[PDB]
């Protein structure tokens, strides 16, 4: 008794029946079906009754508007009820509901007291319903296959790279002079209240608000350039922008707060570098970008972009989220000034203060991290 019988209405429910039989055969069970195993020229009622009575462990019924009130289905149900009584198994019969047009108040009188399974929403959902039931009831699974049938069975707060600007000098009111200065008409622009410039309010025939914001951004960028020049950090001229990195030996064993900013790769060193761009949209921030640069003997760079690109490709292959995050945060904390900020000298007294921790984002959805 290890054959799963499938009762249906022929030929109205042939597609689902063939699908289910092929699936159950693939998973490893033994299935007897009216359309795939009945012989040609054989006494078929007698053979069907013999199959139901002598070798049958489950009686899966396909229930639909067609299989309801069908003579063959009803006779099979009667014999299966006799076999269930003789076998003392209260879960011998299992109806399968596949038709959306069959109301639960019109089912056979022989299956009213039975828990049907819903295939109406999706066939895979019902398939796993029946597989769970089979696992619980311990139907004999003739597992004659390995690595194929089991595969068929198988088938938050974030950081960022934005540094908010904590404060601005009050009033707004040549590139080779000491402080950041910008030429404009016969005037000179350098550190109109700035609270109203950064609100889309000030406007005048002397200057427009967008142009004023652009000039402020230029002043901020020049201030950052000079400030990193005053930090004694070596510079690398990229295609359009500039990057900054620390010389080997500058840090204590090339480490700042249990993070390493200089290391080894074969006949080359690797140096973590950053670059900064100041923006006023969506709010005043200092965007930071991460880069890796390679020096021959740890002090001199390589005057070749091909080898630099290849080595940079090789180094990042093993790094992951935590490595990049920690290295960036460590570099920013290294540039930190006193406790939580870092100023840019905008004049004799004026200063622009930048936070040394990035902007924090929060969500409500994550993953279980299934290793």
């Amino acid at each position: 008794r290890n054959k799963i019988f499938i009762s249906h209405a022929t030929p109205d429910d042939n597609d689902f029946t063939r699908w289910l039989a092929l699936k159950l055969i693939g998973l490893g069970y033994e299935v007897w079906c009216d359309i795939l195993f009945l012989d040609k020229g054989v006494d078929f009622w007698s053979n069907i009754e013999k199959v139901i009575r002598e070798d049958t462990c489950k009686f899966l019924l396909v229930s639909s508007s067609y299989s309801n009130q069908r003579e063959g289905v009803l006779k099979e149900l009667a014999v299966a009820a006799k076999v269930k009584k003789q076998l003392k198994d209260d879960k011998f019969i299992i109806p399968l509901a596949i038709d959306e047009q069959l109301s639960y108040d019109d089912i056979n009188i022989d299956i009213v007291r039975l828990n049907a399974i819903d295939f109406k929403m999706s066939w895979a959902r019902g398939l796993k319903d029946i597989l769970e039931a089979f696992e619980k009831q311990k139907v004999p699974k003739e597992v004659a296959d390995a690595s194929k049938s089991n595969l068929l069975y198988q088938q938050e707060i974030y950081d960022s790279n934005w540094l908010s600007i904590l404060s601005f000098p009050e009033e707004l009111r040549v590139r080779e002079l000491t402080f950041p200065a910008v030429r404009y008409k016969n005037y000179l622009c350098t550190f109109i209240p700035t609270e109203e410039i950064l609100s889309g309010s000030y406007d005048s025939n002397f200057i427009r608000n967008a142009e004023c914001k652009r000039l402020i951004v230029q002043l901020l960028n020049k201030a950052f350039e000079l400030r990193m020049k005053d930090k004694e950090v070596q510079e690398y001229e990229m295609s359009n922008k500039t990057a900054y990195w620390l010389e080997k030996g500058k840090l204590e064993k090339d480490k700042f707060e249990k993070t390493m900013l200089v290391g080894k790769q074969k006949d080359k060193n690797w140096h973590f570098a950053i670059s900064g761009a100041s923006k006023l949209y969506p709010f005043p921030v200092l965007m930071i970008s991460s880069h890796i640069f390679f020096t021959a003997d740890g002090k001199k760079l390589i005057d070749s972009s091909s080898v630099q690109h290849s080595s940079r490709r090789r180094q990042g292959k093993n790094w992951w989220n935590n490595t990049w995050r920690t290295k960036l945060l460590a570099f920013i904390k290294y540039l930190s000034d006193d406790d939580t900020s870092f100023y840019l000298e905008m004049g004799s007294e004026e200063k622009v203060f930048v936070s040394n921790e990035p902007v924090k984002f929060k969500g409500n959805v994550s993953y279980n991290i299934p290793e």
Binding site: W19, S122, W123, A124, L151, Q154, Q155, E156, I157, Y158, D159, S160, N161, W162, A277, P282, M287, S289, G316, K317, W319, W320, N321, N322, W324, R325, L328, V359, K360, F361, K362, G363, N364, V365, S366, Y367, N368, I369, P370
Partner: protein, 469 residues
Amino acid sequence: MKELIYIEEPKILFAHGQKCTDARDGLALFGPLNNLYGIKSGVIGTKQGLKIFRDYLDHIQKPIYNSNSITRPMFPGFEAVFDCKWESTGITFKEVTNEDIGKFLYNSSTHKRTYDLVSLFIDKIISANKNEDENVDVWFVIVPDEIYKYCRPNSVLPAETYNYDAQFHDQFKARLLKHTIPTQIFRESTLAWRDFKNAFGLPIRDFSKIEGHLAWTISTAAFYKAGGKPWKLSDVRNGVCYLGLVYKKVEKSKNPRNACCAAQMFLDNGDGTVFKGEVGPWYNPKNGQYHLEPKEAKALLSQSLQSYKEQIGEYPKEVFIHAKTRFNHQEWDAFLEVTPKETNLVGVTISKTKPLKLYKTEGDYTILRGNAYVVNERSAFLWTVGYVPKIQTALSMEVPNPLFIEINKGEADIKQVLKDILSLTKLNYNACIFADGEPVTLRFADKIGEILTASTDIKTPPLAFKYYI
């Protein structure tokens, strides 16, 4: 502290009316939408290429397995998946002797040699399509690796032939547009990846653990180019037409100028999806000006609206014009005066320039794929690359960059805009992947513009993608 919203996965539709998020699982379990009977293949190349192609065809009839099944599902063989026949018995072969390939690849001039090689390859296909009785569905071209390395924009060897770009692939695809022949170009090393090696006894490209992925991709491409439908989008809102604009500079034509090519997508009566191109480049003489004159924009909008009306019978209720540049007033006012009054025009700019990166605190993996940071009612960031729980890995390396969406003209709900962009990334028939990084309305509108600008003007080119990709 800022807030992130998460956007649910779109789901795609397969045979039997079943749904799933992964194309591979859906094709394996349920199979393609439509039913071809088989694919008859025409091969052009040398005898080495014919043998290599036959061997590969025989290789992918049986199941193929990947090293990591969770990340990449297995390949159960071509016919188990696609319910059609594609074997090495429907091959009709047109030999190309090696002497020709050797002798034409000798002028030291990229343009002349490229033109001669393309002509050599395409004349045989044209003749076999005109003067013969055999039926061919997809023609397969097997170029030796030695000519691939020399036919590139910047290539140096270690008469209307100067009017075309010096790239084998683009010119070859362009010059067959007026005969409507589907084709699939291969490299000898792509199919015989073991036999091509380096100083060490290893292949240059190692497909040992990703061989099932290559089988999936090649089979899906061959099944699409033969006139098949492997999947579709389950949920697309009715009465919505999506467009796409991209600018490709028409290099070296009497001056520096640039053109524009488009694509369209909508749901038609019968629950069908009409994903087809929008052909006919529209130019402007200015150099570096990525915009349209009013006259050249009225034509494009009229064409798209007429196409939709012809197929459906009524004008779209909503039209979304995705692009990677920003519209100006002069051209957007050309719009809205060819548009009817019962239709909404929304212009969405999609860019990947702003450098925002998000890192997890005390972790090792990346951010999810549905996360979005809504900056405003006209701006937002969307993460189309990230960690996908089903395949237990992310779609990139390092930390992905977000996609910056900005409503430019009109008024729309940004959440709906993101929802519609995310479902436009599941229709890459050139690939068999979980999902793409950018909408395909912008990616397929780029291939057509890349092929249409590598040849002389050709009147009324085809719209179907199978003649381009």
